[PDB]
Amino acid sequence: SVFGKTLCRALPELLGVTLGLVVLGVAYAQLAILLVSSCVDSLWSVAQA
Amino acid sequence: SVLRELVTYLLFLIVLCILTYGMMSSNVYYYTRMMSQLFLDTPVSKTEKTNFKTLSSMEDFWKFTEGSLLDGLYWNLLLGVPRIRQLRVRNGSCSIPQDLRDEIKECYDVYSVSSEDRAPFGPRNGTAWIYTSEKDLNGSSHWGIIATYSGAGYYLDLSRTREETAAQVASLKKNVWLDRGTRATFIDFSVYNANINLFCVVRLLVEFPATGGVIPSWQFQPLKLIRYVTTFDFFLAACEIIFCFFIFYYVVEEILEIRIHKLHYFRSFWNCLDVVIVVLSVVAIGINIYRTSNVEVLLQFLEDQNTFPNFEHLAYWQIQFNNIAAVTVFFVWIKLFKFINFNRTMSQLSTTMSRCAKDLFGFAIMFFIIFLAYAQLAYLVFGTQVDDFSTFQECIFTQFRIILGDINFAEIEEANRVLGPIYFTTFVFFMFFILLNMFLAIINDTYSEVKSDLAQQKAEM
Amino acid sequence: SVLRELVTYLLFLIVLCILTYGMMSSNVYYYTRMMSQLFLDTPVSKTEKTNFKTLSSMEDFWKFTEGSLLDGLYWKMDNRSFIFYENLLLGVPRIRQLRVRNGSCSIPQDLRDEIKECYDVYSVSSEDRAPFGPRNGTAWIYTSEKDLNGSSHWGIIATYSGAGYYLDLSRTREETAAQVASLKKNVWLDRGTRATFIDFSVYNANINLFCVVRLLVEFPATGGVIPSWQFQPLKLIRYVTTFDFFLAACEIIFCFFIFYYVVEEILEIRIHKLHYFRSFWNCLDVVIVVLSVVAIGINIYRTSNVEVLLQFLEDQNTFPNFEHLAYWQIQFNNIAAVTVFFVWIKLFKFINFNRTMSQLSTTMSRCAKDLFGFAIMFFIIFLAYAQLAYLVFGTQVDDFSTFQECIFTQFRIILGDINFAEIEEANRVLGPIYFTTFVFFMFFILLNMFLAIINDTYSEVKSDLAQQKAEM
Amino acid sequence: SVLRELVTYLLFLIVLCILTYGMMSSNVYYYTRMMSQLFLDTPVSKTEKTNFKTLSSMEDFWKFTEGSLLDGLYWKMADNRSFIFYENLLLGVPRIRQLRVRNGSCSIPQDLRDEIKECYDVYSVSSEDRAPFGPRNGTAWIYTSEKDLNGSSHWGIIATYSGAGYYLDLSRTREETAAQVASLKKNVWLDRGTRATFIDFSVYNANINLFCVVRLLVEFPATGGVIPSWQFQPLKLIRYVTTFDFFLAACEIIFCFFIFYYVVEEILEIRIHKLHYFRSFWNCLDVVIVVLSVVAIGINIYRTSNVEVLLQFLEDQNTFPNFEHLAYWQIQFNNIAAVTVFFVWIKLFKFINFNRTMSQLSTTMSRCAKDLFGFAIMFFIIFLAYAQLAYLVFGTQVDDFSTFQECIFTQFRIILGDINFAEIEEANRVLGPIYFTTFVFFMFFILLNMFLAIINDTYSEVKSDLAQQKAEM
Amino acid sequence: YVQELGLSLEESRDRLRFLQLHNWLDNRSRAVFLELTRYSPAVGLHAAV
Amino acid sequence: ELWPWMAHVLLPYVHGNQSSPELGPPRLRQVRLQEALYPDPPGPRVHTC
Ligand SMILES: *[C@@H]1O[C@H](CO)[C@@H](O)[C@H](O)[C@H]1NC(C)=O
Ligand SMILES: *[C@@H]1O[C@H](CO)[C@@H](O)[C@H](O)[C@H]1NC(C)=O
Ligand SMILES: *[C@@H]1O[C@H](CO)[C@@H](O)[C@H](O)[C@H]1NC(C)=O
Ligand SMILES: *[C@@H]1O[C@H](CO)[C@@H](O)[C@H](O)[C@H]1NC(C)=O
Ligand SMILES: *[C@@H]1O[C@H](CO)[C@@H](O)[C@H](O)[C@H]1NC(C)=O
Ligand SMILES: *[C@@H]1O[C@H](CO)[C@@H](O)[C@H](O)[C@H]1NC(C)=O
């Protein structure tokens, strides 16, 4: 009976973790999509890292 | 008090998330990739199944320069005239060993400023056979693949019609222009899209190593011309001025606040993040206003002219502005967390991280020590064979991709049959079963301790 | 105090890094890249599409040697050859073969009347030594290993001797073509042929860096062709420039550091502190000094004997025998790379400056015995699965051809790099059972046990350091 | 004493490893690869790109037959034999067979019996044709029963085909076989009633004493299309030729003696001592090991005792050598032996308890198994619930969910990250991405972590009990 | 544009040639949208192509 | 070039005396759009639609 109870009581924590993960992912995705815009095809190390 | 900060942050974020929309929604990527396919992968001629990306010989370069290049330059095109230049080295710049000089009588060192050649060669007629310094050649460094190339060299500028450029390149090929001393060659031009508003500066470099063969590389840079003829322009102009007002408000309130906390202000993470955001924003605004007040040659070359448009001082600033207005967006987005950490079940998830960061940084140091040991071993073992470990940066990035599951393992095993698989197996085992679990151990212990102290010392009265 | 050890180790690390940076001359990769592209990817003829990497029969091999090989070897400006107008071809290339003798195995009496000849797999005890063909030259007479200055090779199927039937080609295409045509007319590759080697070298005087090229073709006893290649950029004219003298001085500085380390370590265990092996850093130090002295010995032994280069210089119309130098250079590179890796992980002896690093190091050291104990069980299970996979797919898949291939493939399954389209069709039942059980037990059981052990150990260490401290 | 059983187990393991090394000989993989690439990768002719692996119609089968097949089978050196790589001798003659069905074995609706004049059912034993057809002169046009043909069932991909049908034994020369297949193609042999076709032959390769049996099957489903499959199996039927073979025989005898010792030791204990004996999990492993070993010994004895097919083939060598049963039993023996070796190696955990860390881990695993089973019930229920949804929604368009077991395998491959989204996405614009994303989240974020919670709790509890009992007594 | 494309026996090709020659949908034609039917008498399932 | 396609693989598949119970003649339903289109684009064509 424990397995069902645990997943029921950890829902707020798991939802908070997913919200943080998706906010961080949105930030990084916008950084990446706005970062290149060049089509250089070379080791632009500072921008490549 | 908190509500005012929340509403002003949402306003500053809603203006910013639509100000960046006008930067990524201009379809510049489509134009750049259209030009890339137009100039790169089209075959030199129908009888050769080769393109600029797969050049391998000097004759391939001569075929390309009279071929797909002319077709692309001649068929919203040809801002002024293109230019082609070369950098070469000096006979005798390297020393032949004594016991072998009886058979070999020429030595051409790798490219260096000290070994560069400045004497005239061939028929002393014009600019193609005389050395011009960097200061009067209107150029700068390039930072190529196997060396860093100066802005000097032997240059020649073509003309506005296909026939005369073809005649010029045929004359150059007739009396040999690319000897054994030729180390690099550059082709530069500019194209005006003229459709809505967009330039494109195109640079092509071919490198001749001291051993043999060629190495091609390319660089396309889309500029930007500012003009307001549609509501889609005035809307972004208003957004930009409101954004500038927002930085003004933030900086004036920061100056107001620092008066009371001249030293007791730089200990909290949020305030230092705010000040780095505002300084990045003011730098971006300064670069933007510097660049926008340079419309004097952007339209001067639209008329038919026979001069090379030296559009490098603008591309550099266009590149430098993009990759600092991107980190600003990242930092603005990650400041939203401060407003999120107000729920009763959300402040635990933030205090946990703020309490375990001290140990996370130290274990990151140790992890990177081990990571660099593996990277250096891989560089020393697979350096000359694999092409994924050809340079140290490539070794680091290849290891990072191996962690994420981007293995090749074919040439890794081919290069070295023993100590090649050993490296792979040990790296995978340690990075998959041991090393990446310690971060989770630290986080777990911190979360347990935080929860225990928060639920035991509180929730008892 | 202790900072003397820190500064000594920092100086040693700087010297080692200087040595390895000088050893790793930039853009040597492109040299070998162009050589391999010229000799390995060119089609054997204008008509066909096969290259050296895709040889399939003896006729393909004969088309290679009268084709792409000769086109790449001989370039147009007797006169010498320059492979890319820069790489000088040294002397002449050499072609050798190893073959077995007819009757080297036994045909069962049941069908002896139908089959007359059998040729065994290659082995030293079963190789032919008798003349054959038009017995006039050295290509038809067996020459011993000692009279040929050869050595073993350790190919893919077997380890081949340094003897065999050899021929030295010419300096010009117009004679090498005739020699190869003459070898092709009078059949030189029969059913007894087991291996063939082609060897040569180039110089490229621009940089100071030789290149030794060896190509191998193996003919298994079941028909077919297996090709292999090796390009090694040696360096034999060490002292030409100032940086060369700088590296030479750094070498003797490294020797002094190694001598100091070994004398200090042996002084520490003359009669002082018998059996210090209970510690871990001491074992690391003795491993480092052993590896360093082995590397120094290898370097001294391979650099004091370059007479094979003096001779070739006396007469530049012979075969430059440089395979021993390439082999020892590879050995030296392996030893040096391992030594550098083990030297780098010695920083953990010194990163204890704050308290957080001390806690992290204590936790890392205290979770060693539990992790070793569980790794024993993990590897028992891993090897059981590897043996099952080897016995089931060992003749069909080619990722399970050998036991070590099975181990590597199992390590790559975890990262998701296999087909499973060939695993499922090689055996429809017991094929997918292995895959599903392996994935389940590796992901949902063993990884979680590793993390559970680490979490418990970290919690206990933090707890008892918070108990003994701040409470006394 | 523990030492006695330990040393006898190590001796058993050594002889098992010797047997496995002996049976897995020198590189037979290269033998198999050369044969497979010769017969499966060469294009059917010099102007098409189709090989046997990518057959797509009935005319492609005819192109392959009088084509790449004869090119690979017959190699030029009075009616001289053929050596495939100048080393592999072709044994006797190849054979070609087909299995058909009957016209009118189907049910056409009465409202459609005016533009549909013939329906052929799917293959089944109760529906296969047995009547002569075409130019009913030879054996290719006359049915032959399974007993007159010495055949057996096959278990192909679509169905399990019997060992009967219409067959031809080809010739030893390229010209005669080409004429035979041209005659078969002229007087139409493969028609809409054809359901399966087999090609069978064998080679020897006297260099390493090892036969190779080759079977190629092409299935024609009732719904149209072509499905090819292949099988190359190496065998060893003349074992005793070298000293190593005698060494292997001695090792096999030693293995039989060890198995007898283990079974008698088992029965000496099960008799009276500890009548229950089943609450150990080590006794179950021992009994399954001995059962698998005795099954393998029985299969080996039944298989190597009769080689009368080889003896009959050695009388005259112008006939078809029938080695299919030997290959079938070789595959069965290989499977049984591999599983036995795996379990014998697993049995080693019974002896690694030499310190206080091994016992801790073993106790942890033993105490965790029960609730791991309890939660694995739920994990498998949810896994099968996702699998059946994938089967019902994507099972008619995607080829990765076409069968239920294939759905299970694809779901296991998704965990490793070996997913191809390029075909699943357009199979259903909605419920396609939903299935994938929910599966990934609830498999990595939820169900993978409950296993950790359980294991972590039981390990910590075991350590706490072992440290509270100790240092307090 | 509903074109029957019937004439099962032999005149289907004639109808196709007449449509091509008369320029039925030469210019200003977005899609073709050809679709008829299927019927597997053995398995007992129909199909729409 | 879809007319050769129809004449080569479609009509033999429909009216051929082989396994293809069609159950009803085929059909064609194209569009006209009531407006012509410009010629082929030199270099790059339309992005998607
Ligand atoms: C320059 O080249 C010529 C021939 O190309 C050669 O004779 C001369 O030695 C070279 N110069 C030096 C300094 O080697
Ligand atoms: C280089 O120097 C300045 C840069 O604008 C200019 O006056 C001069 O004409 C340039 N030289 C050229 C364009 O050849
Ligand atoms: C090979 O050896 C056998 C054994 O004596 C002999 O009969 C046969 O003629 C030999 N064949 C050749 C080609 O040497
Ligand atoms: C073998 O070499 C001798 C010496 O030159 C030559 O006369 C003879 O023709 C050669 N044999 C053949 C078959 O060419
Ligand atoms: C082997 O080395 C010796 C060195 O004294 C040399 O004379 C001999 O020619 C070499 N062998 C061959 C086949 O060249
Ligand atoms: C198949 O049987 C039907 C009636 O059962 C008959 O009309 C048809 O002609 C038959 N076709 C062949 C090929 O025997």
Ligand SMILES: *[C@@H]1O[C@H](CO)[C@@H](O)[C@H](O)[C@H]1NC(C)=O
């Ligand atoms: C059937 O076999 C007989 C046997 O003599 C032969 O005469 C006849 O030609 C064969 N039928 C055909 C169609 O070839």
Ligand SMILES: *[C@@H]1O[C@H](CO)[C@@H](O)[C@H](O)[C@H]1NC(C)=O
């Ligand atoms: C089946 O086996 C028997 C036993 O020798 C043999 O006589 C018969 O020819 C075989 N069947 C066929 C079709 O060859």
Ligand SMILES: [Ca+2]
């Ligand atoms: Ca020491």
Ligand SMILES: [Ca+2]
């Ligand atoms: Ca027992």
